[PDB]
Amino acid sequence: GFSNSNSSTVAIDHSLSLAGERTWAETMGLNTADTARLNANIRYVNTGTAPI
């Protein structure tokens, strides 16, 4: 048997898409030369004999 054949398919598509996104982000910047700041709590004591 000797069968020939020939087809032609014509198509079309429509589409929707609803994309909802919630993004959480956190960042911690630092400078190695200026990491900390200081503060002293100090008093002055006179154990002498004359005031200054």
Add this chain to the structure above:
Amino acid sequence: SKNEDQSTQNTDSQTRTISKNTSTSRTHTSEVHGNAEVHASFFDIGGSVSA
């Protein structure tokens, strides 16, 4: 002191993607068949041609 400023970032992301799609298609088919046949018996021989 090395005046170098470094930073680290951590990020989390959750995405919900809801998608729709639809389609149609239309196919058109032509076909041309052939055939030949030779039959043989004790005393009966035939032949056949088809398309």
